[model samples]
Target: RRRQLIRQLLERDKTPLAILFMAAVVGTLVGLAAVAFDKGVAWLQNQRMGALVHTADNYPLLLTVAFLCSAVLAMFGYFLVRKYAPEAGGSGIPEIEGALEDQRPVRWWRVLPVKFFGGLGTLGGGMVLGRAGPTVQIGGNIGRMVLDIFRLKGDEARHTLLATGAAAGLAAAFNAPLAGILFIIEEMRPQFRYTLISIKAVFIGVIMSTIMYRIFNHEVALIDVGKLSDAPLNTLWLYLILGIIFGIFGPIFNKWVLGMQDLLHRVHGGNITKWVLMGGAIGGLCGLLGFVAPATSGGGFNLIPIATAGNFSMGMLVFIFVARVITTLLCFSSGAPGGIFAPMLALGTVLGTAFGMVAVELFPQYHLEAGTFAIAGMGALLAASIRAPLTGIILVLEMTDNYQLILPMIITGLGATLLAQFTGGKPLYSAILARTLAKQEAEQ
Candidate 1:
């Protein structure tokens, strides 16, 4: 009886150990995958840009060539996604969430190549999109892919690997392992099988993935805005106000995104030519925007720190804000493989900088830096839209390397989420996932 009891105890202890090992494996794989994805996209960007740089001296002709090249690339991305994996669109976060709930299937074979190459095209086309979302999604899909390839037959293995891949993806994306771990714990609470995530496993995985990122790309925030001052207690209300604005905008943005998607769905009517042409139009316009005012196009990651530096006039900032929003809506809603993360960050910075500028003008006493508000806004929009304030705060904090501003970041993020929720905003990714699931059901 004692021997039997010992065996049972060992078996019970074995699970956490197994989980930890899985996490480490997932981390290593995801880390490499994320790094490779980055390199791949960069390779595409350089190749495309290099091909055109020789002709770019003649501005008009260069612009025309750039537009056409980008149009073709974007069309290629759309065709692949529309023809192959329609569920692979948007951030892919929602799909993961749906998968965890077992409400959606993980078609890894379809998602992997489609998201990978399609992301390369759309992202390389200089459209306003973030690579982080795609990376995360790809990482998760890779996890499933590996499991399926190995013929892993257990729910424990499948669930743990998916969660680990996601965490690893987040870690690789920002080179911020802690944030990735926290994102799993905080944002993915419902979806993440908590009992499966051993802290040791998560830590090991994050460490390995982070090491991989360092080896390939060195340690740097995806967006490095030098640290800014903390928000004073008196100024807390201002952030609350900012959150309120995002609250209003968040739902409207989600509504518009879905509306545009449905509009495209109707317009395309499952026609490859129509879909490709529509994608080309958006991509071509993005290229044109790049030529006209380059700041308005692209992922806006590089433009963010510059904008937040309080350099641009408020008028220019607002113009860029409006312009990018329209372009972002157009590009993303057209069902491209790119992500809205960077675009959303850019939008937040615009409004945040605007608010910061007005605040400075109104009360020079605070000695405010627009950049500080810019940082706060970076996460606020995410909080508002995703309803994942914790993840958004941690992401900004990790990306900026400004841990001191956690209080203000949390305040802003929480406030944004609260107001956005009250204003009836659903999580943007969740909304997208719902649409995809609905479509799949309809077809079935």
Candidate 2:
């Protein structure tokens, strides 16, 4: 009887192990897809940028090329979404959330292509969006794709694969597996339907995806800002103050974002030509910035280090911060295919750096490194805006490789999230998703 019980227990364990192994496959493919997505977009962008700049030494021709190239790219994205897949239009996160909730269907065949190529067009056109969000969506689609192909019959298996794919996609994007797992756990917490088997699948997926990502893109942190020293206990108050500042702005920012989207929707009235032109205007401006003041353009990843390193005056930092915020809000809120993750990271850094400058001037004796503010700022906007503090902190640590600053980062993120909560701020992405769902329901 004891031997029989042992055999039964082994059989019981085998199912979860089998699921995890499948998750590993999902992760591996997701990582490869994310890596290819990044490299492909980068190549396309460089070729477009190179040709445009080379031909346009004259300012007028440069402007013309900039607008025309962007217009073409924007139309390509609009056409893909309108002609092929409407669900692939914005950041893919909500679609994943909707799918997990069973409120939205997962049409992977439609989403995968539209998101991949459409994202390449919008992002490659120099719009103010990040690749992470789309990659996560695509990753989730990959998970579903795998499940369909492998004939996973149950909801449990299906959910596990979808979540695993998303985590893997994030890991590949930033080479931050820990963040990827945390993102799924925190952001998708409500929809994830967590279980022992599910958590194991997530782990396996992230590990496999990370391994594949490393194979293609050696193990380097995406944003390698050398580790900055920790903020002393005395300066903890300053972080709290910064959090409060972001807290006040967080809701307002969301309002502006949604409002902009509403305005754009009204402007276009579902007209493809109008939508394409608006997207092109934003893209063209981004391309123009690349030529004139490259610092303000791109995804703002490069600007993070410079801002944190105290290279710019406080005034200049503020100016750039405001400019990027407007551009970020415009480009992303217009229903473009890119993400706001990188732009938000950059925004947080700017605010943190500006605050650090002020703090140092006020407390000369402390001799604080502005870079620490950079680190703290890294996650503050994410915490306040996305309402995923744990994921934000893990993402920062993963990108900066600053394990020692965990305490300060956590404290700062906690402050940001808590304060934002107090300010009655809803998470930005969820709020956007809610609007989308409402529209869909109304149409139906």
Candidate 3:
């Protein structure tokens, strides 16, 4: 169909309809790419461990094979990233924020493949990482790629498409469209150029992305922690207590992550060989640790439900929490190409579930369910760390579909954010962005 009435209507308006149309196109592409990344990571994981279980005869060979499996996959990731596209390392999120400010270049040609397969290497190696960073970075890259392909030229168009793809990628990543939208609004507020065209594109693209996601036949929420029991008025105070605990932990976690980064940077001194070796070492160590304690490795998404189900004793929960924190710091601090988002959620669940179990013991008459705090703690840690409570709330709400805990989520999220700030905490991504920017400046 040729342009007729639509053109006539658009001729009178200043809005270029092409941008909006391309937004949907970018969104759909992002969703498809995200689908590929999800399935692709799992597929690679299968190649690593799926066949190993069948020939479980000798313990010595199994241990050696397991450690070697992770090391090789992880070294491949580090080699490709450091050799080909250094920007592809770590969470490409801070890089995305820089690009939004027009400070960094979008080398989609190099980035797209590097992140997808490189991510497969790291995450499949069982490093503590999430799919969101790669997906969002890939999504952002895809937006630029589409615009470049179509020869669309303008700052407005470029910015809108970049944000649209980012939002869409997050929606596709978590199956939480609204949270994806708000992630940009809140998380990238300083960099996000708030414009009618940009926001509208973000909204449209996220919807299309989410629609394309379901079209792939994914029917469940990302977490699927099940319906949690309601928190009573008397028990609401306990949620705030949980929030205070998270607030205390938030800055410490961020600082330690930063400290570890400094430690690794000091050792590697930007040497590719040294860096890759360190990465492989971490992966091998994680493999060894995971063999002994499976819950301490990987992104921790699988552990959230089991931990929240009260399957572990209080002592066990504390142990897993402590072990994962160390593993999370080591894997993430080693400059692995993954996100800390899911790992953080898993940490929150363990800590919150433990706190809630204790509250259950403390307040016998309240008839409290520990899982409610599990859910709240889920959001509170993210809220405290990233400093985006609403995004955290919506993310948990969409992922769990539990609407009754809105009050507690709000309360816990706010309290956590409040005390985190008072304790001199910064938003995790922003801090990462600053580090990236400072490094760029020093290089220049």
Candidate 4:
């Protein structure tokens, strides 16, 4: 009787109880994976930086060692992605998006290992990448893995679990459960099946993953910007203008990103060895840059508070902004196992703060806080490029814990979204998915 009941539960096409149970399992696994990836990267970074610290007296030797260490680490990541799972390269969010749409296949066995370790290698090399991408991918693969392990059958189970894992992964990565749920609903709405059972699974997944994350990391804001003042209605138009600025640049930025990929492809000429070596060169340059200007390298998480604290002069802000753009493009477009989200967030912070400084100079009566703009701008680029205003808004809000600035953030996000759409900007993930599909078809 017990065996028959278990078989019935597994064989049922829409077993709500089984789905919810598996969602919790997927969430727990993904949360653990996220923590492991973060800790792994941190450990590697500390080891690399610790050795460099000892060589502080010798600048030439320091540079040489840093370049080699980072180069080797990043090259390993590229090799893993190239050799084992090409789908693990770049931000794995697009791959998850592809999987959700059934346009791509998920080889969980290959992707889970490659993305976790590959992410450790690239991110640990102090490259400008975020852990969220790999975590999300890992989460999706975990969902699939759970389904297969439990012998769950049906398209519904597959789709729901994949989304649950991805969302749980994002939530675990950032410790923002609400944003994770909203991300799936808004950013992945087209592919994510919106059913009561599916939504419940997502909620449960997020809850479990968030619990796991908090257990390991404790309750702490990811990006501590502190409490910011509310944006007065009179100055609301400024955020709108900021959005328009992002809107105009959004499409252009996307084009440049794709162009960079094409450029790298041309340079490498479809050779795996060449591609990995080129990745090494870029990693080497970034490593060298880290010693030169600490703020300009890495994932930019360390630079966020410094940038938002009004540390840099207006001129310096502009310089850092441009320099980071170049580095971000080089690293992200090279097809390594890393994410552009964090780098882009850093870029947005500098640019927004620069604009805010100017605003302060121009209008002293309003008593504007540059940090507010920084917070608003944090989500603007994401809103513009990915065209997911709600996710960007919620993510920034949750990360910063600035509920007072919600109105301004929304205005900025909406402005960017409207302008990005008006200016012919496609969603970044969608574009990547389209490219992947086209490539897959071509190969076939």
Best by TM-score: 4
User: Would you list the C-alpha lDDT of every candidate in the order shown?
Assistant: 0.78, 0.81, 0.85, 0.85
Top candidate on lDDT is 4
Candidate 1: the clashing residue pairs are none
Q: What C-alpha lDDT does candidate 4 achieve relative to the native structure?
A: 0.85
lDDT per residue for candidate 4 within 229-317, as digits (tens), equals: 77788889998998898888778888988889889899788789999899888888888888888778888877777767777888888
Winner on lDDT between 3 and 4 is 4
TM-score of 1: 0.92
Q: For model 4, where is the 10-residue window of minimal lDDT? A: 188-197
Residue 181 in candidate 4, Cα distance off native in Å: 0.8
The window of 10 residues in a row where model 3 has the poorest summed lDDT is 188-197
- Please list the Cα RMSD from the true structure of every candidate, rounded to 1 decimal place: 3.3, 3.3, 4.6, 4.9
Per-residue lDDT of model 2, residues 1-444, tens digit only = 999999878866444656788898999889888888888888877887787759867878877777677667866886788777888877788778777776777789998898999988887777778888889889999999988988878777877888898888888888888999988877864543644338778888999888887888884556878867766678777777777777777777878888888888887899877887777777788877766676677678888888878898887898888888888888888887877876888899898899888888888888788778777888889888888899989888888887877776787788888888898889887887788789888988
Model 3 regions more than 4 Å off: 1-15, 191-197
